[PDB]
RNA sequence: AUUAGGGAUCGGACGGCGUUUAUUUUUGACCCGUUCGGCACCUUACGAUAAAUCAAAA
């Protein structure tokens, strides 16, 4: 269940009120792919 | 009373008699008092201190008369820390022991400082208006309450 | 990616460092542990342990030799020597329980120790003469200690006064410098190895970067992915800082945030230091001054620094009204770094 | 919608209000 | 002055003992005061120091 | 460039540290005609004169 | 807008300040060695390990 | 008035969490609240606390507390029911803890698993 | 559980570098600092939520 680094960026940049869900994202057992873009638009990221 | 006199119990009985006679010009709790109880264990290394267990109305008898009294007791008697205390046989009894230990100063605060694990410490902070002649007695008082109760409480003037 | 990874304790790991040879060290409330990361096959199990001394709050390690010290919360610090000690030497203020957050080994004068205590109070120590040396009590609490890696008598403390205080060991009569730079209370300090710079890492979303001699903000740093910075320390070039967050991140940032490093050309460094010198000459005029001090700042933080300024202005107003309409008028106005200390104690 | 709401009952401050219907439903999910 | 004195209180005892430790430490700080003064009132400081240069005199 | 403003530096320092002309003074201020408590002090001093 | 608003704190007098600056570091008006010696920085940090100082220097 | 001085304290606790204050002042205090602070410091949401008498409590915190809450009807629960209550309260089964008064005293669901006891759910923290 | 304080508002009560009552002590008027209590502004919400209601529908 992979998480693009853009998505991880979006869920940190969201307010502290989602910190639990951000932790759940932050979990280490699930792989990650970097990206090459500018500025954290997750939808563009996934569709690419 | 309750005691058969020991080697220094008879000494303090004779001492209250020699405070009755051949001295002041002050006698209120001297004559109606007898041998009641006492205990002597060392405080720290080498240093020692005496606790004198006292009947419960003679506590307020002493609170009428304790000025100059512990002073003469220390300067004639063995040159160690003299301290009066009540004679009792839970928590409120412990607080009574505390407030009777610290006789000239009223306590103000009881801080039960907890630690990062399950350990706790007790501290009592005293009054500011008397601070001078209490610090070199603080270690003594704390060793007394530890040896009498087993609980480690530290005494402070807060800063 | 990672070099080497293992779990270490149950509770939150309060402390960590490396040994002067290669091994690394972990304090948490469960205890003190020692692993070796750069083993050629990896092991997860530690190779040294301790569990005695209560909750261990922090570590401090020797500049050169194999000494380390563990600050506990029992009002006690205790020092081990590697390969030749088991429980170490237990030193404290001889009648003291109040907790010891951190401790930094000096690297100017080795074999010297300072630590903070929760009586709003600091204690200087020595290792030759195994005893505390001095205890200063200030107005409100202090959070993490440091001494300067060039100026030996100069120390700095990070304080719940929201303040970085530069003290000097020989003379605790006045604060040498007051850095009144925050809204929330500072979580960390680290001296640059140049001895000329300083990271002050807030609880709030703000690093502020500093020289030794301003008294105010040279730099503010943040980004909103990092709510509450905790451990804020320099690298060995004194160019690049590290920033361990609350949001689960290690960040690699720069000091003097506009200097693009590498290997320049001669005319390039000419132009850069030309800019430096020119700005040095004219660093006071309104125009260049405001375009100089105009950073950008997150909203709650800026609202709060306006709050702080208004409230402290009212506080100073009440103080001066009390002075002018009290008998304090016929006295000397004490300066603020004099006012900085409450009391000092031996 | 707030993540930090558990899926059982209504909260007023830190008072999470649960009905006996909800608690009996938990018992039914156990059974 | 071979006379032994009255054993003073432990508080004042440790006070003067750690005061002596403080005087020792202050001596060991005065042994650098001049160098810190140099690097303060000096012209141009340099880093890294060639004294911790791991290849110093080769 | 970079020289000091005299009036502004006087305001800065102030905010930091904090018989023959009076006749033309009255003749100039007799046309205002604010009651002017400073002119009250000036009138009492001209009366003592 | 270009006139000096506050006297910079290290200085003391108007003539001190305004006759102190008085001179351009810039290249068109002074020599090249003048340029180098004026524009060199107060600290010079070269590249590598800056460990704290070991021995006294001064 | 709110008779649960427990919940009033915890209201102040989550208020300090939301406001970023690193301390509190629980003006009326009691031992069950003290036991709750002991377990919250057992697993480290809170730095360190103490109690003063005339009684109030000061508690220095981190920020790693997210929420504390009380179970108002003070419900009974058993072991498989403990597992179901755990999953129906918490976000994920390896985060946070619930607060269970057992006959062995007060403990979390993890300690309740270690010691194999049932009891009453009164609150929780994550 | 507070907002977040500040500006003022007066009811006490406390203090004082001081002016005027005061021929000098009371005491009173002006000014300041402390303290509770409240009518209310404004900002920030600490959030809201059914919005036009908000320092309360937080
Ligand atoms: Zn992408």
UniProtKB/TrEMBL annotation, chain B:
GO function terms (MF aspect): structural constituent of ribosome
Protein family (similarity comment): Belongs to the eukaryotic ribosomal protein eS7 family.
InterPro entries for this protein: Ribosomal_eS7, Ribosomal_eS7_CS
GO cellular component: 90S preribosome; cytosolic small ribosomal subunit; small-subunit processome
Signal sequence extent: none
Protein name: 40S ribosomal protein S7
PANTHER family found in the cross-reference section: 40S RIBOSOMAL PROTEIN S7, SMALL RIBOSOMAL SUBUNIT PROTEIN ES7
Any one GO biological process: rRNA processing
TrEMBL record, chain C:
Signal peptide as annotated in the record: none
Gene Ontology cellular component terms for the protein in this record: small-subunit processome
Domain of life: Eukaryota
Residue stretches making up the Sof1-like protein domain: 255-341
WD repeats: 179-210, 222-263
GO annotation (BP), single: maturation of SSU-rRNA from tricistronic rRNA transcript (SSU-rRNA, 5.8S rRNA, LSU-rRNA)
Start-end of Basic and acidic residues biased regions: 333-346
Key word Ribonucleoprotein present: yes
Compartments where found: Nucleus, Nucleolus
Main location: nucleus
Region of interest (Disordered), ranges: 317-346
Keyword Repeat in annotation: yes
UniProt keyword terms in alphabetical order: Nucleus, Repeat, Ribonucleoprotein, WD repeat
Family of the protein in this entry: Belongs to the WD repeat DCAF13/WDSOF1 family.
Protein name in UniProt: DDB1- and CUL4-associated factor 13
Taxonomic source organism: Chaetomium thermophilum (strain DSM 1495 / CBS 144.50 / IMI 039719) (Thermochaetoides thermophila)
TrEMBL record, chain G:
Localization of this protein: Nucleus, Nucleolus
Whole-protein coverage range: 881 to 938 of 938
Protein name: Uncharacterized protein
UniProtKB/TrEMBL annotation, chain H:
CC per GO annotation: cytosolic small ribosomal subunit
Segment forming the signal sequence: none
Keyword annotations from UniProtKB, A to Z: Ribonucleoprotein, Ribosomal protein
Record's keyword annotation contains Ribonucleoprotein: yes
SUPFAM superfamilies noted in UniProt: Ribosomal protein S8 (SSF56047)
GO BP annotations, alphabetical order: translation
Molecular-function GO terms, alphabetical: structural constituent of ribosome
Family: Belongs to the universal ribosomal protein uS8 family.
Protein name per its UniProtKB record: 40S ribosomal protein S22-like protein
Protein species of origin: Chaetomium thermophilum (strain DSM 1495 / CBS 144.50 / IMI 039719) (Thermochaetoides thermophila)
